[PDB]
Write a protein that binds this ligand. Structure first.
Ligand SMILES: CCCCCCCCCCCCCCCCCC(=O)OC[C@H](COP(=O)([O-])OCC(O)COP(=O)([O-])OC[C@@H](COC(=O)CCCCCCCCCCCCCCCCC)OC(=O)CCCCCCCCCCCCCCCCC)OC(=O)CCCCCCCCCCCCCCCCC
Ligand code: BCL
Ligand SMILES: CC[C@H]1c2cc3[nH]c4c(c3C)C(=O)[C@H](C(=O)OC)c4c3nc(cc4[nH]c(cc(n2)[C@@H]1C)c(C(C)=O)c4C)[C@@H](C)[C@@H]3CCC(=O)OC/C=C(\C)CCC[C@H](C)CCC[C@H](C)CCCC(C)C
Ligand SMILES: CC[C@H]1c2cc3[nH]c4c(c3C)C(=O)[C@H](C(=O)OC)c4c3nc(cc4[nH]c(cc(n2)[C@@H]1C)c(C(C)=O)c4C)[C@@H](C)[C@@H]3CCC(=O)OC/C=C(\C)CCC[C@H](C)CCC[C@H](C)CCCC(C)C
Ligand SMILES: COC1=C(OC)C(=O)C(C/C=C(\C)CC/C=C(\C)CC/C=C(\C)CC/C=C(\C)CC/C=C(\C)CC/C=C(\C)CC/C=C(\C)CC/C=C(\C)CC/C=C(\C)CCC=C(C)C)=C(C)C1=O
Ligand SMILES: CCCCCCCCCCCCCCCCCC(=O)OC[C@H](COP(=O)([O-])OCC[N+](C)(C)C)OC(=O)CCCCCCCCCCCCCCCCC
Ligand SMILES: CCCCCCCCCCCCCCCCCC(=O)OC[C@H](COP(=O)([O-])OCC[N+](C)(C)C)OC(=O)CCCCCCCCCCCCCCCCC
Ligand SMILES: COC(C)(C)C/C=C/C(C)=C/C=C/C(C)=C/C=C/C(C)=C/C=C/C=C(C)/C=C/C=C(\C)CC/C=C(\C)CCC=C(C)C
Ligand SMILES: COC(C)(C)C/C=C/C(C)=C/C=C/C(C)=C/C=C/C(C)=C/C=C\C=C(C)\C=C\C=C(/C)CC/C=C(\C)CCC=C(C)C
Ligand SMILES: COC(C)(C)C/C=C/C(C)=C/C=C/C(C)=C/C=C\C(C)=C\C=C\C=C(C)\C=C\C=C(/C)CC/C=C(\C)CCC=C(C)C
Ligand SMILES: COC(C)(C)C\C=C/C(C)=C/C=C/C(C)=C/C=C/C(C)=C/C=C\C=C(C)\C=C/C=C(\C)CC/C=C(\C)CCC=C(C)C
Ligand SMILES: [Fe+2]
Lengths: 281, 304, 254, 42, 52, 52, 52, 52, 52, 43, 43, 43, 43, 52, 43
């Protein structure tokens, strides 16, 4: 089970809750208090989804959908056949995600490395929460949360968006899209560069970071560096998720009209409003 | 307790001008500026840059593309700078009319679009060759070029290939900020719902995975930067405890792990697959499938 | 080719998605195999080769040609696993059964186990493309000065115990990347010791090192040379310092 | 203190500052009451 | 009073810069919110007063 | 007065640059204000006066 | 009488490049203002004068 | 004349590749403009000339 | 006069590149402005002359 | 002083030239405002 | 003194020729403005 | 002084050639403008 | 004298062959333009 | 007549690649342009000719 | 003289072969064009 170098690192310590208790491994996996808790929550949520689609009568995993309660039910707990199962699954998902992050914390402080990874995961956890907890609360009902189905939560996406015309015109949406695109670009380029240096042309010696900096300088005139590219991609992904959470928290709580009409304040600015010509004149 | 997000102390001396490994030192500039605002995050040295035939061609063609679009914008605004700055995001050099089919358009907007797209073609392919040659000169692999080729594949599918198969340049993308968003929306609407395209879903899977993976990887390196993790090329051949602790964090967390060389293959592939799958999906829309929701219904992931 | 099914409902889009499933299976195989050039073959807690070695086979060896005459590195290779192998570890089994922790027997910081672990890298410095040493003291880096930010040089070093152990003296800088890697400390005991910058936070009046206490600053591994630091020494130093976040927590205050 | 050399130069600097401010504010009040008579708001 | 010690702590240059920026923005906003007032717009007022 | 020391504090380069940019943008703003109004617009005014 | 001294404060090259850019873009903006108005558009005025 | 000294300040490689791309793009653009106009389209003109 | 020292302040090759680029883009601007107007469009005007 | 290093003579010369330029600028501006007031008064 | 480093004499020469160019430019511009005002007045 | 380290003689012959080319370009432009005004005036 | 390092003799021969090529290109262009004008005039 | 010196300024291994790519793309563009025309589409015209 | 590292005789050889290939290409293209003209003329 152990890698050639894993033994010296398997020591006691790095636990937030429990000590000697739950400080062991199941194969490669480290299981602590929060490993136990996240296993419990994940298994319970999986079994709840399976029982829900059994009740519905659907076993094609591409048609399984556990839908939330209705908008009329409000914030109340609904019949388990009418949305209570979605609610329990959401509770279990939150618990499992949080326990996964805290397990990562334990593992990090056992290995002696920084806590950047659970911090980065917390952003995705918080976006999921914005979607299923907070935005429903400000809107007054859990019926505005997305369903647990492979192709039905896409219907939720589409309808939630087209409730505001084209959702492309949300500005935080724009920022999130730009950051996602740039994150993918930067990841492709980083992989390409590291591999081009480490696996060079046939018959040539291995390269260094000098060659990488030189390639990107000759190409575009700037190299951010080995540490800079990592800081940059991390922050890019985090800002993408942050601006997505922003685009959604304001969508039906502070904005209610089509998002394309927001931009018409720059068109209605009193000094170029009635000039004739262009699209808006 | 120092997370290494920002640099505390900047140091610097003479500029790193580069390495001679096959490069023509005459085409490389001699000017460099250091900017400290970038030093708090990355490197501060701005420059130098290589100026050759392919970069010259690409610069010329891309400047002409930009300028053609801007000239149409100025015409559409009536030469009024105020209407230009007012309607900047609403102005557009739009793809030809359908009446022209695939022939050379017989309109001003359409021929302007045609010539701007010609310049775009030349610039993008010249830049691809630039990447290839800038790697070949330093004796580096061509992974950057093969990654750029996927984005070029999608861009081509959008502008050149699919308009041809579908039989009209009106299917291509216009040159405007809001108009190309409208183009995406109308594309999804014309062909059922593009969500129910499987290759669209795959492109999205890999886009999301790119951010998942870089968050994981950058957080990992910053977590093991205290052990020298950012120096990856030396960890690949002379493994240190940084690589081992990263691998072990991820093994203990989710059972499997990568190497310091091997996670960059994941990175490269998640990058290129976005645009590969997206290009295939855009090709299949209109040419093989007219509606994606009905296709999903027939193929078992949409209810009937 | 709309509504043109080769058989049944199978058209070019279904062909494409199934072809992609196949290509993706092959690609997962390739990536997981290429992720096996370190760490294998798998071991027991006794050090022996395990009955289970995985479901993907370890791939064929590739060769890395190194610059500066450093040679050729083959991955995977028994030579690479033997060179990077720690021997005579100071750990005791917590249990006879597998999957349980191994406890240090002495001072895990000095004995280099756990988060204080170090890998036996080559006792040779990391070089740049020209063949010079990558990390230098800034005195030996011709042209290098502090272009921005606070200069730590001369600042007192506060430890986890909130006690002071010395003053910063010199800065060890990555020359090709133009960044600080280690700051050297003049210990009040008359010794010089390196500490990574990533584990040191510059305040206006002090440099705070919360990883290790005042007791541990003395037993930090030293460099055989005062002008160069080897990969091995770097790994030992950084491991020692990091291990304090666990093994110096009872002393840590505030 | 924080400047390290203002212990007495601060007198000169505050003096010139006061003169400039006095000019500014006399001009401003002239304008204000001129506006008041031209168009009063209260 | 004894306000001459404000500069011992504060940097003169930064104080002057922020003061200038703030004063200009303030006067701009005053003039602008007057321009929005139909009665106080000196331009429209000079328009009404004379014939044009 | 004693105002000449403002150069003993400010860099003539930066202050001259900022002053030039500020003056130019201020004049642009004022001209554009005048043009915004059907009156005080010298172009349309001339069009009306000369009958063109 | 003393303006020659400014060349000790500012670099001639930066000043000249900035001046060139500023003048060209100013002239362009003014020409476009004129061309955007039916009157003052010399091309339409000429098309009319010669009745073509 | 002395125009031959333009090579004491320009590298022939740079100017040649730039000139080539410039001329190729200009020619393609003019040809495309002509094809955009139903008149000056030599293909359609020849089509109508021979009655096809 | 003594304009020739403009070659002592800044460099010839940069200004020559900038001059080529600027003159080309400006000439294209003017040609396109003339084409935008049905009058001064020499292609369509020639079409109309010879009856085509 | 320690902020830019000039001296009273240097600063007086600079203020002289600066105020000459400023007085010229403002004289031009007042001439223009007077012409405009004649053309189109705004009091 | 001189942040740039130029001499007083070099600065005087620079400014002399600068004024020569500026006055030639303003001359052409004044002639153009007179021509226009005759052709199409604006005020 | 000479920011590009170029003499007065070199700069002078440089300007000579530059102005010769300038006047050639300008006179061709002038001939073109004469023709253009002749077949279709604009003022 | 030379930023590029070329000699006046090298530059002379280079400009000679360059102008040969340019005049060839221009001659072909002029012939083609005459042919097209005879074919379909535009001015 | 001294055009052989073009190979003293560029190296042939890159020039020939560029030239072949350029020529292929040019031929492709021209063939496509002609296919876009029913009159010079040789497949459709052969069809119409032979009666199929 | 030379920036690529070739003699004058090397360049003469290279250019001779290049020109033979070019003229072959052009002969083929010319025959093709004559054919197409006879078949469907565009002029
Ligand atoms: C290393 C791994 C690599 C993986 C990738 C491999 C890549 C390399 C190449 C591999 C090539 C694979 C084959 C490709 C070509 C064939 C494509 C294909 O399968 O098309 C669907 C194929 C039929 O093609 P079609 O043209 O889409 O069908 C139109 C018919 O009219 C359909 O209508 P019908 O007249 O037959 O009847 C319709 C009806 C009848 O339904 C059926 O007859 C079957 C429907 C359910 C099939 C479920 C199959 C699930 C298999 C799972 C196996 C375990 C997991 C394996 C993978 C593990 C690792 C991930 O459907 C219903 O849903 C009826 C429900 C009951 C009503 C009462 O499906 C079938 O023939 C039935 C399902 C057979 C199993 C499919 C498994 C996938
Ligand atoms: C109403 C909107 C429709 C929709 C319609 C479309 C359409 C239509 C398309 C997609 C496409 C994509 N959509 Mg969408 N999309 C929808 C819903 C979504 C949702 C969501 C959560 O709702 C998500 C996450 C996505 C996600 C995505 C991406 C995964 C994918 C494009 C990847 C990419 O990088 O393209 C961006 C990358 C490029 C275009 C490559 C660019 C490369 C070139 C060479 C750039 C050269 C630069 C140039 C010369 C200028 C340089 C400037 C200077 C150098 C600075 N869409 C809905 C259903 N979407 C695209 C796709 O892949 O199709 C499957 C696509 O065409
Ligand atoms: C914030 C930047 C990006 C990011 C980062 C990120 N994600 C992370 C991490 C980080 C840094 C981890 O360390 C952690 C990890 O270990 O990844 C391998 C993780 C992770 N993020 C994951 C996926 C994921 N990340 C995503 C994206 C992102 N995460 C962001 C774009 C996305 C999408 C959709 O964009 C997904 C799907 C997992 C692989 C992993 C978290 C694993 C986990 O939570 O395990 C515990 C739970 C289970 C094993 C199962 C729970 C089952 C539930 C009870 C049912 C829920 C049903 C569901 C809602 C239905 C949907 C249809
Ligand atoms: C693998 C898929 C991802 C990807 C990768 C990718 N892009 C790339 C590369 C790679 C690997 C390069 O090597 C190349 C590059 O040089 O990057 C710095 C590039 C590149 N992709 C770019 C943009 C880009 N990439 C995008 C996305 C993506 N490309 C995908 C997510 C997107 C969008 C919309 O998502 C854009 C807009 C450029 C920055 C660069 C190509 C440069 C180019 O072709 O320039 C031609 C024009 C000029 C030089 C003149 C421009 C004039 C104007 C003033 C501007
Ligand atoms: C610096 O280099 C690096 C490495 O290498 C040194 C690496 O490896 C990695 C890691 C990255 C990769 C391997 C790349 C591929 C990864 C992805 C594409 C990310 C997506 C991830 C997955 C699909 C895996 C998901 C797996 C999960 C969630 C595990 C599922 C398991 C369980 C639910 C069981 C868990 C068991 C527990 C808690 C114990 C049981 C307890 C009981 C009581 C019973 C990175 C980032 C890296 O940067
Ligand atoms: C379907 C998407 C992935 C869901 C998770 C599946 C993996 C899992 O649960 O456990 C893997 C398990 C958990 O770890 P493990 O401990 O079993 O790992 C064992 C590894 N060996 C045997 C080689 C030592 O890992 C494996 O099976 C090893 C390889 C897994 C690689 C999976 C990569 C998937 C990436 C998909 C991206 C593209 C999406 C489109
Ligand atoms: C676990 C699989 C459980 C499948 C249960 C089942 O019967 O599903 C029905 C469905 C069959 O769909 P279906 O036949 O019901 O869909 C069409 C039916 N109409 C038209 C009536 C809507 O099975 C599947 O979808 C199987 C999917 C997985 C197949 C293997 C994929 C391998 C490649 C990687 C992914
Ligand atoms: C939007 O609102 C509108 C535009 C309608 C109204 C607004 C109008 C505004 C804001 C107008 C503003 C106008 C201004 C500020 C104009 C300023 C003009 C100036 C300063 C012009 C200067 C011109 C200078 C010239 C032409 C100089 C030429 C110089 C030479 C040819 C040589 C110079 C250099 C030499 C000789 C170097 C010699 C070297 C040595 C070493 C001696
Ligand atoms: C102030 O203004 C000035 C003039 C100074 C400058 C301003 C310029 C401005 C405002 C420019 C604005 C540009 C904008 C807004 C551009 C936006 C572009 C966008 C959003 C493009 C999006 C997608 C484009 C795609 C996918 C294009 C693909 C093109 C191709 C694949 C080209 C293929 C070739 C074609 C179609 C035919 C030509 C081929 C041949 C062989 C002739
Ligand atoms: C937007 O509004 C529109 C555009 C519609 C209207 C307004 C347009 C405006 C305001 C346009 C203004 C254009 C201006 C002011 C242009 C004025 C003159 C220019 C820039 C003329 C430059 C000509 C330069 C040329 C042709 C240079 C030729 C050079 C040579 C033949 C020789 C090159 C150098 C050599 C041989 C080296 C000399 C010797 C040694 C030893 C180095
Ligand atoms: C509807 O109403 C709502 C609820 C929205 C709010 C209602 C009521 C509120 C918010 C009331 C708030 C009242 C407050 C905040 C009162 C006090 C305000 C103060 C203290 C304002 C801030 C600054 C005042 C200053 C700086 C005034 C004078 C200070 C000085 C002259 C000290 C400068 C120091 C020097 C020169 C030190 C020199 C000596 C040495 C030894 C260096
Ligand atoms: Fe990396």
């Amino acid at each position: 089970a152990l890698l050639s170098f894993e033994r010296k690192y398997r020591v006691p310590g790095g636990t937030l809750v429990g000590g000697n208790l739950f400080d062991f491994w199941v194969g490669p996996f480290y299981v602590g208090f929060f490993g136990v808790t996240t296993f419990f929550f994940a298994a319970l949520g999986t079994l709840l989804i399976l029982y829900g689609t059994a009740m519905e009568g659907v076993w094609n995993p591409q048609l399984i959908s556990i839908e939330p309660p209705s908008v009329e039910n409000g914030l109340a707990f609904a019949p388990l056949a009418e949305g209570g199962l979605w609610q329990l699954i959401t509770i279990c998902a939150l618990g499992a995600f949080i326990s996964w992050a805290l397990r990562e914390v334990e593992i990090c402080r056992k290995l002696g490395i920084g806590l950047h990874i659970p911090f980065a995961f917390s952003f995705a956890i918080l976006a999921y929460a914005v979607l299923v907890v907070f935005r429903p609360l400000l809107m007054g009902s859990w019926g505005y949360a997305f369903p647990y189905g492979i192709w039905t939560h896409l219907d939720w996406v589409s309808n939630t968006g087209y409730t505001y015309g084209n959702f492309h015109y949300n500005p935080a949406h724009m920022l999130g899209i730009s950051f996602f695109f740039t994150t993918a670009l930067a990841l492709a380029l980083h992989g390409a560069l590291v591999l081009s240096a480490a696996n060079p042309e046939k018959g040539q010696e291995m390269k260094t970071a000098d060659h990488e900096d030189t390639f990107f300088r000759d190409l575009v005139g700037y190299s951010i560096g080995t540490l800079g590219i990592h800081r940059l991609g991390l922050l890019l992904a985090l800002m993408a998720v942050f601006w997505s959470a922003v685009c959604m928290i304001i969508t039906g709580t502070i904005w209610f009209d089509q998002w394309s009409n927001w931009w018409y304040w720059w068109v209605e600015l009193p000094w170029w409003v009635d000039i004739p010509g262009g699209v808006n004149g | 307790e120092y997370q290494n997000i920002f640099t505390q102390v900047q140091v610097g001396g003479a500029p790193e001008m580069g390495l001679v490994e096959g490069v023509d030192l005459s085409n490389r500039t001699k000017g460099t500026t250091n900017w400290t605002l970038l030093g708090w995050f990355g490197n501060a040295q701005i420059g130098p840059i290589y100026l050759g035939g392919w970069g010259t061609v690409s610069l010329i063609s891309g400047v002409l593309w930009f300028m053609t679009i801007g000239a149409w914008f100025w015409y559409e605004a009536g030469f009024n700078p105020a209407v230009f700055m007012r309607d900047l995001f609403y102005l557009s050099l739009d793809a030809p009319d359908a009446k022209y089919g695939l022939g050379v358009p017989r309109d001003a907007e359409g021929i302007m679009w045609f010539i701007a797209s010609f310049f775009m073609f030349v610039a993008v392919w010249s830049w691809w060759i630039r990447t290839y040659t800038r790697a070949a000169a330093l004796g580096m692999g061509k992974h950057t070029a093969w990654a750029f080729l996927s984005a070029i594949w999608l861009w081509m599918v959008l502008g050149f290939i699919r308009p041809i198969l579908m039989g009209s340049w009106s299917e291509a993308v216009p040159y405007g900020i809001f108009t190309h968003l409208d183009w995406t929306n109308n594309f999804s609407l014309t062909y059922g719902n593009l969500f129910y395209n499987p290759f669209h879903g795959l492109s999205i899977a890999f886009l999301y995975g790119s951010a998942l993976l870089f968050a994981m990887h950058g957080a990992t390196i910053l977590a093991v930067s205290r052990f020298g993790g950012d120096r990856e090329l030396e960890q690949i051949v002379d493994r240190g405890t940084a690589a081992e602790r990263a691998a072990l964090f991820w093994r203990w967390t989710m059972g499997f792990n990568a190497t310091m060389e091997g996670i960059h293959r994941w990175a490269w592939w998640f990058g290129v697959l976005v645009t590969l799958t997206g290009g295939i999906g855009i090709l299949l829309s209109g040419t093989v499938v007219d509606n994606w929701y009905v296709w999903a219904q027939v193929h078992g992931y949409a209810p009937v | 080719m709309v509504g043109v099914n080769f058989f049944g409902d199978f058209d070019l889009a279904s062909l494409a998605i199934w072809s992609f499933w196949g290509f993706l299976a092959f690609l997962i195989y390739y990536l997981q195999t290429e992720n096996m050039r370190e760490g294998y073959p798998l071991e027991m807690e006794d050090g022996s080769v395990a009955p289970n070695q995985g479901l993907f086979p370890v791939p064929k060896p590739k060769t890395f040609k190194l610059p500066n005459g450093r040679g050729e590195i083959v991955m995977p290779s028994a030579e690479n696993e033997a060179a990077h192998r720690r021997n005579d570890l100071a750990l005791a089994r917590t249990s006879v059964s597998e999957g349980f922790p191994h406890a240090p027997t002495g001072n895990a910081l000095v004995d280099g186990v756990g988060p204080a672990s170090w890998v036996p890298r080559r006792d040779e410095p990391e070089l740049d493309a020209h063949g010079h040493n990558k990390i230098m003291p800034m005195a030996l880096a011709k042209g290098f000065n502090v272009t921005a930010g606070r200069d730590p040089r001369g600042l007192p070093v506060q430890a986890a115990d909130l006690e002071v152990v010395g003053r910063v003296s010199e800065l060890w800088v990555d020359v090709p990347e133009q960044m600080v890697r280690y700051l050297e400390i003049d210990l009040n005991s008359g010794k010089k010791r390196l500490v990574p910058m990533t584990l040191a936070k510059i305040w206006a009046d002090r440099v705070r090192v919360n990883a290790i206490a005042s007791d541990s600053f003395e037993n930090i591994p030293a460099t055989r040379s005062a002008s160069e630091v080897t990969k091995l020494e770097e790994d030992k130093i950084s491991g020692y310092v990091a291990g304090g976040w666990l093994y110096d927590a009872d002393k840590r205050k505030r | 203190s924080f400047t390290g050399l203002s212990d007495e130069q601060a007198q000169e600097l505050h003096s010139v500052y006061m003169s400039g401010l006095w000019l500014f504010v006399t001009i401003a009040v002239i304008a204000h009451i001129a506006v008041y008579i031209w168009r009063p708001w209260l | 009073s004894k306000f001459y010690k404000i500069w011992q702590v504060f940097d003169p240059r930064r104080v002057f810069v922020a003061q200038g920026v703030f004063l200009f923005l303030l006067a701009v906003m005053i003039h602008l919110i007057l321009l929005s007032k139909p009665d106080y717009n000196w331009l429209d007022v000079g328009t009404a007063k004379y014939g044009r």
